[PDB]
Structure 1
Amino acid sequence: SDLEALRKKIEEVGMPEAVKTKALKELDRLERMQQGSPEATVARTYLDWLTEVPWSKADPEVLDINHTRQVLDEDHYGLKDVKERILEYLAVRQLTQGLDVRNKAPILVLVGPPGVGKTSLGRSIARSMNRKFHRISLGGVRDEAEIRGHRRTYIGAMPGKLIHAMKQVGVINPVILLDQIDKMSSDWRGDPASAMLEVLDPEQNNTFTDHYLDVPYDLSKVFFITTANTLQTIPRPLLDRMEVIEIPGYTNMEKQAIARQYLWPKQVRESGMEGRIEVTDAAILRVISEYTREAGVRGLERELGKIARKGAKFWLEGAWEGLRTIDASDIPTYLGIPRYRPDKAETEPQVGTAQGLAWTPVGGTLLTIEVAAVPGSGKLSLTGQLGEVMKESAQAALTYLRAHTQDYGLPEDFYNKVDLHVHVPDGATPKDGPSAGITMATAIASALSRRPARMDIAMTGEVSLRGKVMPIGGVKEKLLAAHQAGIHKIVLPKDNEAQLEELPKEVLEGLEIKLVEDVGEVLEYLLLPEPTMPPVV
């Protein structure tokens, strides 16, 4: 029957003769098996899978850097450094031309907060080379099985993703993007990363061997791109064989540009609402500042989506012909009362308040740090779900201030006559780390001093007893947030000067960066020199 037709099919679909041999034996050895036998079902499915996966099929594929250069420009805004870097990479892969005949595939990672376009570029490249794009995501995958699969024997047996992807793509040479590269839970039963190496070692991969199939399969052609939010969660073996591109977020201007060129028209068009609605640029700036909080734009698309969709509903009811076009005042109508309306800080300096920034893979945030000096016995209380390493920095900061009673404007006997409370809202979300060493020191002096502190400035650094600010991480991520926030007057450890080169250059003269090498200078810059409140006694 259709199995006889299947015999004809297997041949038509080109594949190595060993595969023919194995497959034909399977076919023959099946007939006998009486149909409906669970074994029968399983054997048949294997046959079917074997036939559907792209063995020899080809796809017209091209590589002009310049043509591709144009495309990337065609489908993305800015990212000049990031764009150029890609071609600089891509280029060398051109020399290999297969044919190096060694040293191919030092593969890519795209790193940055989510919503920064990483996958979109992937999608852009693979059309740029007029070849197929597929998304395999590796988020929190706990097992090897997922990649190299479980043997055909066991119940609910299925080939790994890698095979799954290849059937579905329909050809032997697509761009494949493995994102959530670093969201792999690891080796809790066994290492699954390994199987990846099997995937991405050029020598190794030519005969990639899934387990559900019993045929080595070849992934030699495939192009691989990876995505991640940080590199601290990749095993080193993968990590040593990657070239790193960082796409670390956009700024309100960069976002506003992106929105009108790409995000706003898609959503109008997507909505079927083309030509009946539009937003002012002024409006959009309202959407960035007051409805979203993130480094990369995957909030703006979501909100600009809400508007476009609302519009359709409205019009059919409905109340326009031609454009209703929108501006700021017209936003809460579509989108609801603003989320982040302040009014901040106010920046009119306050007593025992200092502005610190913080970051994580999903982005950098701007968080305030508050201290209260109250009369009491010298008990210190540290709330805000502070981790322990942060609590030690309170101590270091507090202890530095303790020794230098005179130099700064401190009461000389707080240590046994006041109690400090150091708080860092919000209450729920955990916070840790020592990069906000100085910033607790500035807050504490204000409290004790009674001297207000500047709240235009937002600052970062670590502190020791000696009083030396020390280098710290996440400089670009944090400073973006300052910029987005509407802060334009940073503070930084000297030894973190270097990290400024990685910043996109435009912002740099949009930011005033004081490099401090010791603590004293932070305070001086931040503390007004006449106190407001009466001292605590």
Structure 2
Amino acid sequence: SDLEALRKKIEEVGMPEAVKTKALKELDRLERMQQGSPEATVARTYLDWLTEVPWSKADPEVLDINHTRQVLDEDHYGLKDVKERILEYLAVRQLTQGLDVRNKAPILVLVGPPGVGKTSLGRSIARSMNRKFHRISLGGVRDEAEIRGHRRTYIGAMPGKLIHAMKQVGVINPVILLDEIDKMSSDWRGDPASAMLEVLDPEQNNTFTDHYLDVPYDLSKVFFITTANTLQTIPRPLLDRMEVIEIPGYTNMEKQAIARQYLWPKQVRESGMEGRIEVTDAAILRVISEYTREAGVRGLERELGKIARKGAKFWLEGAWEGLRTIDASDIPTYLGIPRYRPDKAETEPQVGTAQGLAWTPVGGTLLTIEVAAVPGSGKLSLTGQLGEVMKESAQAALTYLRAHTQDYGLPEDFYNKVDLHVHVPDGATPKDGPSAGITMATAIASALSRRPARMDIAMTGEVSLRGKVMPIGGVKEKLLAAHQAGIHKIVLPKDNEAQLEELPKEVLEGLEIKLVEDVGEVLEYLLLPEPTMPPVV
């Protein structure tokens, strides 16, 4: 009577008319499963979903931003303006919920380096709305292999892994998540972006065309959270209807915060030791700096585990009572020898030198431009694997000085008898871009005038010929690098006064950001008023 039990469950689940006739034809067709079977064994994976797929299994959608906020921060730190845009996508649905919402609304998409929080939010955003998070690992699909299930052309007509999200969950109003959509390639037959349109259509996400599940499934509420790292490979006909929210990356303060309570324990327990060893907050800072050189945090936790594991072996090597503590005075005994020096400022004013700030995709760096003035013919040597653009900024600063030899008390004929030389340690890393011109403008001015330039001041500003300081890019990462180096005075163009707000409130208080517009402001600020070394001529 099992061939009749298929009636019992198919007639009782659901059922919408859109999927009613889809069984009334095959409710009888598959009963020939004694011989073969071309069309009787290929229908057990037909009802076993239909007899098991949920219908109308609803859930109380959270209409309380405090239900979300008070638990989102319960899982993640910082990302304030980021979390500001997150809620900004949330309550747009609950303003027209039920009807006049599912018909048209943008799609949330998260982009950021793969170390920073990208998937945990999915479990965080879903649990905060009484649904079921699901991490469809799309990394591995770049072709027309499985974006919609096969036909009934074989016995292995297992549904599409996409619609299996509707199978794995037991409700009809889930939170379905994707991973790294830019891991595709739409350059051959069966464009893998075509189906995703219908899957993500803010108009027909209630019709899921397939090849074995011939009926386009009707899914009323399917909350979506899309993740990626590169906007480029993301399909074009999909990107154009996504209110994408970027995920920036961490700072050396929050990097100490997360690992203080999240990464360290969630790696200590799994390290056998369930509270029999603990690392001090000061010690983490070393591991924060001297071994962590990643934008995200995926690289960080691996070190702490390596501490725990190699720490665990010490127990079997020799026991110790209670919990053993680990401070910044014993870390190398666990992780080995450091791999990245810190970048600490120098304090004592030096001749013809300045503190340059450089942006890098993994943070910020404090570079030290240094120049020399030797009796020569007037050449200009720009050394240190400098980029072609920066070399232009060097003369740009130098030429400005040449027309103002009296105004800063420079040598009258330094264009002619003083052969400069600009170096930027280290010598192996390609340094590029016009922003550092304000600094160069300083050291060159100092080196000629023999008045030292104080180093407790950071500076960065692109220079123009007649002398106006122009805006730069990446003020956020640079300043953050400057503070963690221990600098408390910064010089910055007037234009970038706007983007000063992105810094945390604390660092902004720590720095006395001098805001300038012309170089004449800087050279009075930075140069010692007295001559300490003899000139060239």
TM-score range, shorter chain: 0.7 to 0.9
For residue 224 of structure 1, give the secondary structure of its aligned residue in structure 2. strand
Q: CA offset at residue 439 of structure 1?
A: 2.8
Cross-structure match for 1:96: 96
User: For 1:128-161, what per-residue CA distance to the aligned partner results, in whole angstroms no more than 9, with x for missing partners?
Assistant: 1232223356679866777569999999999987
Q: From the superposition, tell whether residues 383 and 51 of structure 1 become closer, same or farther in structure 2 (CA, over 3 Å).
A: farther
Q: CA offset at residue 192 of structure 1?
A: 6.4
User: For 1:253-308, what per-residue CA distance to the aligned partner results, in whole angstroms no more than 9, with x for missing partners?
Assistant: 43333322222221111212112111222222333233323454434322222222
Q: CA offset at residue 310 of structure 1?
A: 1.9
Q: What is the rounded CA distance, in whole Å, between the counterparts of 2:128 and 2:523 in structure 1?
A: 53
For residue 442 of structure 1, give the secondary structure of its aligned residue in structure 2. helix
CA contact (8 A) 1:111 1:229 kept: yes
Q: From the superposition, tell whether residues 407 and 275 of structure 1 become closer, same or farther in structure 2 (CA, over 3 Å).
A: same
Q: What is the rounded CA distance, in whole Å, between the counterparts of 1:58 and 1:116 in structure 2?
A: 33
Q: From the superposition, tell whether residues 480 and 128 of structure 1 become closer, same or farther in structure 2 (CA, over 3 Å).
A: same
CA contact (8 A) 1:229 1:361 kept: no
Q: From the superposition, tell whether residues 323 and 358 of structure 1 become closer, same or farther in structure 2 (CA, over 3 Å).
A: same
Q: CA offset at residue 444 of structure 1?
A: 3.2
Cross-structure match for 1:172: 172
Q: CA offset at residue 361 of structure 1?
A: 4.5
Q: CA offset at residue 491 of structure 1?
A: 2.1
Q: CA offset at residue 517 of structure 1?
A: 1.2
Q: From the superposition, tell whether residues 59 and 102 of structure 1 become closer, same or farther in structure 2 (CA, over 3 Å).
A: closer
Q: CA offset at residue 506 of structure 1?
A: 2.8
Q: From the superposition, tell whether residues 80 and 475 of structure 1 become closer, same or farther in structure 2 (CA, over 3 Å).
A: same
CA contact (8 A) 1:145 1:160 kept: no
CA contact (8 A) 2:185 2:233 kept: no
CA contact (8 A) 1:139 1:180 kept: yes
CA contact (8 A) 1:409 1:449 kept: yes
CA contact (8 A) 1:382 1:391 kept: yes
Q: From the superposition, tell whether residues 117 and 475 of structure 1 become closer, same or farther in structure 2 (CA, over 3 Å).
A: same
CA contact (8 A) 2:343 2:365 kept: no
Moved more, 134-143 or 437-446: 134-143
Moved more, 278-287 or 408-417: 408-417
For residue 177 of structure 2, give the secondary structure of its aligned residue in structure 1. strand
CA contact (8 A) 1:152 1:158 kept: no
Q: From the superposition, tell whether residues 166 and 324 of structure 1 become closer, same or farther in structure 2 (CA, over 3 Å).
A: same
Q: CA offset at residue 485 of structure 1?
A: 3.2
CA contact (8 A) 2:470 2:495 kept: yes
Moved more, 145-154 or 380-389: 145-154
CA contact (8 A) 1:144 1:195 kept: no
Q: CA offset at residue 323 of structure 1?
A: 0.9
CA contact (8 A) 2:359 2:477 kept: yes
Q: From the superposition, tell whether residues 241 and 392 of structure 1 become closer, same or farther in structure 2 (CA, over 3 Å).
A: farther
Q: What is the rounded CA distance, in whole Å, between the counterparts of 1:331 and 1:119 in structure 2?
A: 31
For residue 134 of structure 2, give the secondary structure of its aligned residue in structure 1. strand
CA contact (8 A) 1:248 1:477 kept: no
CA contact (8 A) 1:435 1:472 kept: yes
CA contact (8 A) 2:172 2:220 kept: no
Q: CA offset at residue 400 of structure 1?
A: 2.6
CA contact (8 A) 1:356 1:439 kept: yes
Q: CA offset at residue 41 of structure 1?
A: 12
Moved more, 221-230 or 501-510: 221-230
Q: CA offset at residue 470 of structure 1?
A: 1.8
Q: From the superposition, tell whether residues 506 and 371 of structure 1 become closer, same or farther in structure 2 (CA, over 3 Å).
A: same
Moved more, 339-348 or 278-287: 339-348
User: For 1:354-405, what per-residue CA distance to the aligned partner results, in whole angstroms no more than 9, with x for missing partners?
Assistant: 3333335543343344444455454444455544443433343333333333
User: For 1:65-123, what per-residue CA distance to the aligned partner results, in whole angstroms no more than 9, with x for missing partners?
Assistant: 32322222322345455445533442332222132346753233445555443433332
Q: What is the rounded CA distance, in whole Å, between the counterparts of 1:31 and 1:409 in structure 2?
A: 102
Moved more, 522-531 or 47-56: 47-56
Moved more, 298-307 or 179-188: 179-188
For residue 243 of structure 2, give the secondary structure of its aligned residue in structure 1. strand
CA contact (8 A) 1:93 1:104 kept: no
CA contact (8 A) 1:106 1:242 kept: yes
CA contact (8 A) 2:45 2:157 kept: no
Moved more, 365-374 or 137-146: 137-146
CA contact (8 A) 1:199 1:219 kept: no
Q: CA offset at residue 532 of structure 1?
A: 4.6
Give structure 2 stretches of 5+ with no counterpart.
none
Q: From the superposition, tell whether residues 106 and 144 of structure 1 become closer, same or farther in structure 2 (CA, over 3 Å).
A: farther
Q: What is the rounded CA distance, in whole Å, between the counterparts of 2:495 and 2:294 in structure 1?
A: 28
CA contact (8 A) 1:276 1:324 kept: yes
Q: What is the rounded CA distance, in whole Å, between the counterparts of 1:50 and 1:433 in structure 2?
A: 61
Q: From the superposition, tell whether residues 154 and 531 of structure 1 become closer, same or farther in structure 2 (CA, over 3 Å).
A: farther
CA contact (8 A) 1:98 1:104 kept: no
Q: CA offset at residue 459 of structure 1?
A: 2.5
CA contact (8 A) 1:152 1:213 kept: no
Query: Is the radius of gyration larger for structure 1 or structure 2?
Result: 2
For residue 22 of structure 1, give the secondary structure of its aligned residue in structure 2. helix
Give structure 1 stretches of 5+ with no counterpart.
none
Moved more, 114-123 or 274-283: 114-123
CA contact (8 A) 1:144 1:193 kept: no
Q: How many residues are paired up?
A: 537
Q: CA offset at residue 327 of structure 1?
A: 1.8
Q: What is the rounded CA distance, in whole Å, between the counterparts of 2:294 and 2:13 in structure 1?
A: 49
Cross-structure match for 2:438: 438
TM-score (norm 2): 0.79
Q: From the superposition, tell whether residues 294 and 277 of structure 1 become closer, same or farther in structure 2 (CA, over 3 Å).
A: same
User: For 1:2-57, what per-residue CA distance to the aligned partner results, in whole angstroms no more than 9, with x for missing partners?
Assistant: 99999999888868767676789899999999999999999999999999987877
For residue 148 of structure 1, give the secondary structure of its aligned residue in structure 2. coil
Q: What is the rounded CA distance, in whole Å, between the counterparts of 2:492 and 2:406 in structure 1?
A: 25
Q: What is the rounded CA distance, in whole Å, between the counterparts of 1:286 and 1:518 in structure 2?
A: 39
Q: From the superposition, tell whether residues 508 and 20 of structure 1 become closer, same or farther in structure 2 (CA, over 3 Å).
A: same
Q: What is the rounded CA distance, in whole Å, between the counterparts of 2:498 and 2:56 in structure 1?
A: 50
Q: CA offset at residue 313 of structure 1?
A: 1.6
Q: What is the rounded CA distance, in whole Å, between the counterparts of 2:420 and 2:166 in structure 1?
A: 62
Moved more, 355-364 or 2-11: 2-11
Q: Does residue 1:311 correspond to 2:311, yes or no?
A: yes
CA contact (8 A) 2:33 2:41 kept: no
Q: From the superposition, tell whether residues 174 and 466 of structure 1 become closer, same or farther in structure 2 (CA, over 3 Å).
A: farther
Q: From the superposition, tell whether residues 127 and 102 of structure 1 become closer, same or farther in structure 2 (CA, over 3 Å).
A: closer
Q: From the superposition, tell whether residues 225 and 102 of structure 1 become closer, same or farther in structure 2 (CA, over 3 Å).
A: closer
Q: CA offset at residue 174 of structure 1?
A: 3.6
Q: What is the rounded CA distance, in whole Å, between the counterparts of 1:527 and 1:48 in structure 2?
A: 81
Moved more, 129-138 or 498-507: 129-138
Q: From the superposition, tell whether residues 282 and 396 of structure 1 become closer, same or farther in structure 2 (CA, over 3 Å).
A: same
Q: From the superposition, tell whether residues 301 and 129 of structure 1 become closer, same or farther in structure 2 (CA, over 3 Å).
A: same
CA contact (8 A) 2:345 2:485 kept: no
CA contact (8 A) 1:295 1:364 kept: no
Q: What is the rounded CA distance, in whole Å, between the counterparts of 1:478 and 1:155 in structure 2?
A: 59
Q: From the superposition, tell whether residues 461 and 217 of structure 1 become closer, same or farther in structure 2 (CA, over 3 Å).
A: farther
CA contact (8 A) 1:53 1:163 kept: no
CA contact (8 A) 1:163 1:210 kept: no
Q: From the superposition, tell whether residues 274 and 211 of structure 1 become closer, same or farther in structure 2 (CA, over 3 Å).
A: same
Cross-structure match for 1:259: 259
CA contact (8 A) 2:126 2:133 kept: yes
Q: From the superposition, tell whether residues 333 and 150 of structure 1 become closer, same or farther in structure 2 (CA, over 3 Å).
A: same
Q: What is the rounded CA distance, in whole Å, between the counterparts of 2:185 and 2:378 in structure 1?
A: 45
For residue 373 of structure 1, give the secondary structure of its aligned residue in structure 2. strand
CA contact (8 A) 1:352 1:443 kept: yes
Q: From the superposition, tell whether residues 523 and 27 of structure 1 become closer, same or farther in structure 2 (CA, over 3 Å).
A: farther
Q: CA offset at residue 202 of structure 1?
A: 0.6
